[PDB]
Design a binder for this molecule. Structure first.
Ligand SMILES: *CCC(=O)Nc1ccccc1Nc1nc(Nc2ccnc(C#CCCNC(=O)O[C@H]3CC/C=C\CCC3)c2)ncc1Cl
Length: 346
């Protein structure tokens, strides 16, 4: 049994000469030489079986990624686990090895306008496919965008994804939420459960602004502070946009605030392409109903050199709506065992 940095990393004989890459959202990720395809691959070790929530997320990641097939979405190449439910303690997910993620790249590298434009095109082309399957990613952020040595981009980590449920999107003010703070749409903190496609567009907007300056645009330090940052740049919402917020706690909180002026995008990003800034404005719209949708974003002049709807595929079928929140970890283990069976010899 192979070992890395104290931990069992039990992937062989197919996968050899392991090197530690890092820690991701679920534990240890290694690279390894795939003896069958004769390439290095990325392998993540998942140990979810004690907790229903880790089980739920591992199952979502696995079901979604195995169903999706798209050039801008990470696939699953292989899944390693024990031959029986009883013996199964860890799951290893094998994926294409990528050179970096956008988080590391933004810490270290200035992006040309040409790179920003190509990265944004690829994120939206991947998201068009995701949203066409009636799926919300709900955790788009630079660390969830992988890049290879030629800057092909792939969306990863569908652990927090859900089937879109707009008619059930309303909630009260300051309702707890799971997805990463800096990339959370303002309505999350106000009156939204994050069950509509507009939640992902806000996150892409945040990513775009971060590509323009290498710094997060709304680096809140905590839940309501995230909204301080957003309003500090967008300015006070209009009467129309407040009238759309029926919940009194949410609306009266906004009305309690001193007037804030819009900060013009060209002042925040004086070196940015004016077309990139027009699209940024449309993605970072306060009112989620007025926020641009993925297919309109692809059609925006900023992306004219790449836009080609005939080469921006959609999913053959929408995804199976929701069913895991009430399933215990024992049933969830069985479903994980079942979903991974195709990678077993035979
Ligand atoms: C989808 C989210 C996710 O899984 N992210 C994540 C997070 C942490 C770790 C791994 C992953 N997944 C993942 N990563 C990659 N590829 C990747 C990610 C991060 N960093 C790297 C890297 C690197 C450095 C390359 N090595 C290098 O330059 O080696 C030199 C060093 C000099 C010394 C000796 C000789 C060797 C040459 C890669 N890909 C896929 C996935 Cl899923």
């Amino acid at each position: 049994p192979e070992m890395v940095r104290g931990q069992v990393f039990d992937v062989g004989p197919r996968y050899t000469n392991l090197s530690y890459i890092g820690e991701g959202a679920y534990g240890m990720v290694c690279s390894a030489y795939d003896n069958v395809n004769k390439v290095r691959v990325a392998i993540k070790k998942i140990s979810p079986f004690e907790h229903q929530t880790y089980c739920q997320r591992t199952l979502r990641e696995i079901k979604i990624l195995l169903r999706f097939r798209h050039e801008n979405i990470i696939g699953i190449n292989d899944i390693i686990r024990a031959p029986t439910i009883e013996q199964m303690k860890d799951v290893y997910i094998v994926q294409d090895l990528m050179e970096t993620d956008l988080y590391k790249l933004l810490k270290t590298q200035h992006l040309s306008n040409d790179h920003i434009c190509y990265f944004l095109y690829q994120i939206l082309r991947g998201l068009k496919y995701i949203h066409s399957a009636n799926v919300l990613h709900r955790d788009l952020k630079p660390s969830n965008l992988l890049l290879n040595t030629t800057c092909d981009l792939k969306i990863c980590d569908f652990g927090l994804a859900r089937v879109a449920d707009p008619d059930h999107d309303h909630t009260g003010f300051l309702t707890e939420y799971v997805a990463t703070r800096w990339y959370r749409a303002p309505e999350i903190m106000l009156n939204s459960k994050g069950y509509t496609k507009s939640i992902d567009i806000w996150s892409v907007g945040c990513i775009l602004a971060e590509m323009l300056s290498n710094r997060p645009i709304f680096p809140g330090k905590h839940y309501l502070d995230q909204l301080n940052h957003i309003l500090g740049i967008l300015g006070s919402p209009s009467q129309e946009d407040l009238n759309c917020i029926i919940n009194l706690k949410a609306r009266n909180y906004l009305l309690s605030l001193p007037h804030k002026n819009k900060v013009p995008w060209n002042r925040l990003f004086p070196n940015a392409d004016s077309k990139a800034l027009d699209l940024l404005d449309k993605m970072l719209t306060f009112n989620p109903h007025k926020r641009i949708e993925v297919e309109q974003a692809l059609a925006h002049p900023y992306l004219e050199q790449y836009y080609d709807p005939s080469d921006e595929p959609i999913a053959e079928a929408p995804f199976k709506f929701d069913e895991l929140d009430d399933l215990p970890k024992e049933k969830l283990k069985e479903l994980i065992f079942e979903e991974t069976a195709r990678f077993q010899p035979g």
